[PDB]
Symmetry: C2
Subunit: 57 residues, 2 copies
């Protein structure tokens, strides 16, 4: 494991392998309703951590 | 694999396991300079896909 990726199990079984070096839109737009919710929260919460970090200091 | 998580290899070896159900801030603030860059892009690009999807239609 060298590259970064997200694991979003389609529905509730097989886990998906989507690398950040590409981040396919459809791969996420083909998930289940419950999945879309998790993803949205993933980016939202994450975005908060970044700003919280001091990169200008 | 049922829960969603991100894999950010610290420096360049062992991959990290950070679930989205918690998303630890420090775990990301302790990574390497090259890692922080990838993460920031991960959330940015992802955020675009969401808005691209039609959830109001």
């Amino acid at each position: 494991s060298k590259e970064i990726f997200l694991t979003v199990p389609v529905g509730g079984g097989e886990s998906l392998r989507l690398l950040a070096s590409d981040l396919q839109r459809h791969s996420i737009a083909q998930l289940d309703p419950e999945a879309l919710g998790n993803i949205k929260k993933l980016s939202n919460r994450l975005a908060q951590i970044c700003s919280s970090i001091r990169t200008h200091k």
